[PDB]
Design brief:
Blueprint (H helix, E strand, L loop, with lengths): L6 E2 L4 E3 L12 E3 L5 H4 L10 E4 H9 L8 E4 L5 E3 L2 E7 L7 E6 L5 E4 L21 E4 L13 H18 L3 E7 L5 H11 L3 E2 L2 H8 L10 E2 L7 E5 L5 H10 L6 E8 L16 E2 L3 E7 L6 H11 L3 E4 L6 H18 L2
Parallel strand pairs: 2-3, 3-4, 4-5, 9-10, 10-18, 11-14, 11-15, 12-13, 12-14, 15-17
Antiparallel strand pairs: 1-2, 6-7, 7-8, 8-9, 16-17
The structure holds nickel (II) ion.
PDB class: hydrolase
Keywords: SGC - Diamond I04-1 fragment screening, PanDDA, XChemExplorer, hydrolase
Assembly: monomeric
Length: 341
């Protein structure tokens, strides 16, 4: 039974609520991004309207086989009317197609739902600048001061250098990046760019990238594993057993695998820095783990909310225990105190 924090009051609208069959008095179902915890339950047999970004639509059509008549893509940064309610979609800085949704209620209330996001200062020069926000539905994934991590740019720097270095030393070495959903594509395509390679992957994952409105994408990707010195494999498969077998599969074309595992936060973030990282080596294979987050750090989130100054905050992650909920409320109170609003 759809929880309260997936419902927008005084509309027929839910957000990311496809796993409760039909929802009591929902004219329109919004989807913030194409990640399975958020789209769970969508199928070819979905007959209610779905509102989403262009890229999330491409994905629903081609991957889930949702019928064209039910997919309502909207452009970003554009005032759109939907069932007599003004909405706007903002870039979320999460994965391809991911959006934040501004709802302008008939009664004059204004609601921001962030879906999944990584807050950034460039958001403060959007249509959010222009007016007051009464309720914030907040991605609270890393809402705790321990969670610091480096900028996406820093991590992609580290990844490129490690890749180039290892391949220049040994031009029979293969680079492997682990994946399970969209997002984290800048890791593997930035590596492939420096190397002068296309990225080799399965046909399923090849299809998925074809959905993403990437300029020139056909020059960048391939299924031909043999003509390709950066490869994508399921994250499940990024270990010595699964790497060995993969190195066996390439038919004597590579003597060495350098791999990256894009993990979110991990406890080693509290002690070690990004330039000071080391891999786990078992023979000719080396497996790095890098902290590429697609969610706000504690500080990023704090600064975003102190700038936005909402009247009320509703968390959408870590809400299932009273300890989590209790700890988050305290931090929100402190932020308000620190600022005065
Ligand atoms: Ni997500």
């Amino acid at each position: 039974t759809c929880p309260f924090y997936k419902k927008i009051p005084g509309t027929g609208f839910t957000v990311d609520a496809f796993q409760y069959g039909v929802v009591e008095g929902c004219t329109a179902y919004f989807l913030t991004h194409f990640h399975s915890d958020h789209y769970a339950g969508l199928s070819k047999h979905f007959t209610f309207p779905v509102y989403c970004s262009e890229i999330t639509g491409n994905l629903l059509k081609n991957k889930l086989h949702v019928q064209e008549q039910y997919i309502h893509p909207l452009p970003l940064d554009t005032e759109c009317i939907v069932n007599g309610v003004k909405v706007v979609l903002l870039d979320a800085n999460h994965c391809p197609g991911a959006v934040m949704i501004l709802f302008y209620l008939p009664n004059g209330t204004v609601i921001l739902h962030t879906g999944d996001f990584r807050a950034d200062p460039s958001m403060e020069r959007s249509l959010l600048a222009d007016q007051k926000v009464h309720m914030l539905y907040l991605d609270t994934t890393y809402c705790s001061p321990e969670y610091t991590f480096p900028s996406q740019q820093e991590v992609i720097r580290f990844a490129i250098n490690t890749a180039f270095e290892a391949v220049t030393l040994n031009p029979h070495a293969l680079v492997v990046c682990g994946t399970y959903s969209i997002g984290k594509e800048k890791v593997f395509l930035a590596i492939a760019d420096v190397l002068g390679s296309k990225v080799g992957m399965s046909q399923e994952k090849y299809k998925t990238l074809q959905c993403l409105n990437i300029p020139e994408i056909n020059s960048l990707i391939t299924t031909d594993m043999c003509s390709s010195l950066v490869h994508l494999l399921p994250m499940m498969q990024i270990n010595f057993k699964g790497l060995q077998s993969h190195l066996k599969k390439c038919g004597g074309k590579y003597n060495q695998i350098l791999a990256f595992r894009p993990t979110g936060w991990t406890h080693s973030n509290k002690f070690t820095r990004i330039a000071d990282v080391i891999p786990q080596t078992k023979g000719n294979i080396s497996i790095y783990g890098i902290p590429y987050s697609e969610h706000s750090s504690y500080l990023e989130m704090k600064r975003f909310v102190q700038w936005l100054k909402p009247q009320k905050i509703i968390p959408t992650v870590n809400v299932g225990t009273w300890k989590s909920r209790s700890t988050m409320e305290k931090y929100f109170r402190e932020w308000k105190l620190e600022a005065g609003y």
